[PDB]
């Protein structure tokens, strides 16, 4: 099942099996 | 287990253990 | 539980209880 995102104070989006940083888009 | 986002029709990103509105980044 | 996003190499965010493409909000 998908896990919690990193406990790192960064926003993530979902892409295939990954949490990916929103800052890679914006 | 990761819980659902608010049932409000808006886009949320995952930031640590919180759903945060995408619009706050825009 | 929140399921996996569509496995297609595109970024998704949560909109209520569904995964919706990030691009649709930008």
Per DSSP, what are the bridge partners of residue C14? B12, C19
Residues of A in contact with C20 (CB under 8 A): none
Calculate the CA B22 to chain-centre distance.
7
Distance between CA atoms of residues B5 and B20, nearest Å: 9
Q: Which residues, in sequence order, are CB contacts of C10 under 8 Å at separation 6+? A: A15, C21, C22, C23
Cβ-in-10-Å burial (0-12, 13-18, 19+) of A21 comes to middle
- Model resolution, angstroms: 1.1
Distance between CA atoms of residues C1 and C22, nearest Å: 20
| Distance of residue B19 Cα from the nearest chain C Cα, in angstroms | 9
| Distance of residue A13 Cα from the nearest chain B Cα, in angstroms | 6
The helix/strand/coil state of C12 is strand
Contact B22 C20 (CB under 8 A): no
Comparing C-alpha atoms, which of A12, A6, C6, A2 is closest to residue B19? Answer: A12
């Amino acid at each position: 099942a998908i896990p919690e995102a990193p406990r790192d104070x960064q926003a993530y989006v979902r892409k295939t099996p990954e949490w990916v940083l929103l800052s890679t888009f914006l």
